[PDB]
């Protein structure tokens, strides 16, 4: 699973 950064 590969997630976006929270700050994006």
């Amino acid at each position: 699973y590969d997630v976006p950064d929270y700050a994006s």
Partner: antibody
Amino acid sequence: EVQLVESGGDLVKPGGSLKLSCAASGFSFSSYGMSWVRQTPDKRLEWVATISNGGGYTYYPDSVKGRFTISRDNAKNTLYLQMSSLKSEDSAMYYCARRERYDENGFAYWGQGTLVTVSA
Amino acid sequence: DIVMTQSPSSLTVTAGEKVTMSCTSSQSLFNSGKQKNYLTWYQQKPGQPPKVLIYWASTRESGVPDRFTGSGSGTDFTLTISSVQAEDLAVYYCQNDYSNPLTFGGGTKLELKR
């Protein structure tokens, strides 16, 4: 005890390329995104790049796009930053810090830096 | 880009006194998914990388002294050290952890009186 150890920084002509590695141990690497923050000799800290825990999303500031590339090898547990089109203003200590995937809370784990001096 | 503005850049203290430094954002950092203002405070001592004192504007890291408090919301935030010791003369920065580019403040440096 999480352990991020940077490498690669040398004296590099304004222009040339350099790639720094950052070996990380003591956490499931694949689970976290990583960053490179930079601190200038005027003792100013600067975000330089973030990358996904998986690799597919990369994020840069207007000042690094085109010249640097954050990269990781989850099989070898290592971050990379290929730096090209090196400038004078880029001389600094380069740190890798890990991203807080779970808690979304500050850069909690820092490496011990590597220094790069761009000069001829 | 949220600019970070910390004033003062140098604060001169006496050990045992209370001291408060300010951090200002250009926009809000309140993240409504976590329901938290995503500001982080860091301390750094010469030779070291920075270390978290306070995250989510006011939560203290496991191991930071009781004397270090983070307070504030939206665009106006403060660090307060209830009674400064000499193990506290370091530089303090805030950081915008809310959206890219991530921006750190300029630092405030504790210098000791004599």
